């Protein structure tokens, strides 16, 4: 297992030199399992960050809630359901609030189910902001691969490959990762579109 | 200048994770003061979640499976629900019952009420669907003034809060790491501890 | 010194996440020498715990003596030599007592000498218990490496490697560890495969 | 609930280690009441050993070398002995004499006699073997009602005992940390504590 964590550590460190904002969530620990899980979260966080850049919105790394987003646009409003969006912006000029939900899923049928589950969180919110005089655009993205942006795809591939390598090697991985998440990542690796890499 | 507080907070976190090692997989110990402060704040919340789960006899959801995945483990065929990640859950197939837990700390009772309302509102419609299938779906929502400490000494929960706030209060550059609301909530939480705890020297383990 | 001790602290936490009962003897202090000595004791304790698991007996972390063990089985008995076994069990239904002495030594010749010294502690005890119709089974284990059980060997190696690195760093170590134990640990590390 | 006891016991141990810094290597200060209570109880026994060794002019065996190792240092060749770790030792090479010390505390004289017997019995055969190799072997065995406190005020030793027992008496979670037999021995020492030496 020794070569895999050492390379994964260097992969993570190289990604941070390209996108230093990811330092807030990264880890370079020696524990191979903890390092693998942080690489998996980093993969998802890279996708979010690049979706936020492409949309010109704030990456919600401080994890403020939908209620707190709306607070910065309309101080008085009913208490909505608890939601933490991946990204948001408040356009005071245009009286518009944008929220983003971004994910990766290897198969199109899972992307559609993920998109649905994410959209369902927001029931009723647009109606309330409709009445209270604001535009509320919910953007929901679920794509086959994480958007790499400035990060070479080679590095995102190695996040996936090395983490699964670490996690497949042993029994005790099941304390760290659900069968669902492991299966989704393994499918993304086995069906990886290598044409781009 | 932040080094003494940062070195002490590392020792607090190390001691807590020695006492309750189930938390190790959800935590982290780094030398960066702001990153360490945020890990301490997350650990405070995770300790609360853990002990609420223990007190209720349910699973602490550290793998962060969603509501849809919980229901998959009870009823293979079901419509897609909203995306929710509960703090804890259990599936009692004997009693055809699912329990989900939402746990939080909020220092002021009016904030506790709004938090409880926001958390329970995530689950709109779910109970009806499960009762339609003959199942019980019990949503337990707890919001308390202080974190439940369980086996962790309360002084260490306190030090997570005081040392992280001391680090974050040195320069408002920490605003990039923590929101105004969370920072203010933690400041309010600090004022609910007694004067002796707030002012006494703490030296950690030796 | 801080790279080694920072790593050693996280090695200790990882081990505790797998075997939480080792918290009774663990340390995560900042003093590198105290931390290294604690990691050396943890190494031996892991071996004890896993030997106890393999034998199905109680790891004696409360350090009850042989006289105390026999008091629990046979209330009236002559005073025996003071011994604290690494593990024990009392099977009252079958009138059987088991005690364990577990250790590591790098050289097979030193394993045999260690086994002999641990066995010799118990002279006369089995004869007294057998005279009352009890069995008294003394299990003595001295192996090249700690039994790691559920703990990855990686972590047991790091306990040894990082502790010795800290301790070889200065003759400050002389206040913390005897030449005999340091030499034996250095043997275990230099011959570690 | 255990917080006042824990806070005070932490400071008691800190004060003791200020007085006898050598104890720092052997002791621990933590914030967990149970682990701190066991540290305090172990420290109480270690203070007794330290002062017995000092009072007799012998080495406190803090690195826990075995009897075989002690004899290895004095005599090149010898049979493997039983494993023993004395509380203290001294090798007087010029007078070809080895001294070992076993020190303990027990509340009752009858238990002191039994403990003395159990410690002496560890050493069966050793004196005779060493006589054959030209060496004198003296075994000193001490079991007293209170720990010898030396530089440490007895009030601090009393607090080690009282506060650790207060913590451990609270609940059954203590059964993970201490045997019933050791708890009873310590509680006996507290209930029959002779306060006349605390007055003086």
Numbering used by the authors:
A (entry chain D): 1 to 197
B (entry chain B): 0 to 205
C (entry chain C): 1 to 193
D (entry chain A): 0 to 199
What do the study's own words say?
The two genome segments code for four viral proteins, the nucleoprotein (NP), the glycoprotein-precursor, the small matrix protein Z and the large > 200 kDa L protein which harbors the viral RNA-dependent RNA polymerase. The L protein synthesizes two distinct RNA species: (i) the antigenomic and genomic RNA as products of genome replication and (ii) the shorter capped viral mRNAs during transcription. To initiate viral transcription, the L protein presumably uses a process called cap-snatching. It is assumed that the L protein cleaves host cell mRNAs downstream of the 5'-cap structure and uses this short capped RNA as a primer for viral mRNA synthesis. Here we present the crystal structures of the two terminal domains of the CASV L protein: the cap-snatching endonuclease in the N-terminus and the 326 C-terminal residues, which, by analogy to LASV, might play a role in transcription.
Therefore, we expressed and purified the first 205 residues of the CASV L protein as N-terminally His-tagged protein. As expected from the metal-dependent enzymatic mechanism of viral endonucleases, thermal stability assays showed a concentration dependent stabilization of the protein by manganese ions with an increase in melting temperature of up to ~10°C at a concentration of 10 mM manganese (protein concentration in the assay 4.2 μM). After His-tag cleavage, the protein was crystallized and the crystals diffracted to a resolution of 1.9 Å. The native protein crystallized in space group P212121 with four molecules per asymmetric unit. The structures of the four molecules are very similar with the only difference in the C-terminal 15 residues, which are not visible in all molecules (RMSD between 0.227 and 0.317 Å). The CASV endonuclease has basically the same fold as endonucleases from LASV, Pichinde virus (PICV), and lymphocytic choriomeningitis virus (LCMV) even though the amino acid sequence of this protein is hardly conserved among these viruses (identity ranging between 20 and 55% and similarity ranging between 54 and 79%). Slight differences between the structures were observed in the long α-helix parallel to the β-sheet (α-helix shown in orange), which is separated into two helices in CASV endonuclease domain compared to the other structures, as well as in the helical region shown in green, which is composed of four to six helices of different length and orientation. The highly conserved residues of the endonuclease active site are positioned as in other arenavirus endonuclease structures. We also tested for endonuclease activity using our previously established RNA cleavage assay, however, we did not observe enzymatic activity of the isolated domain.
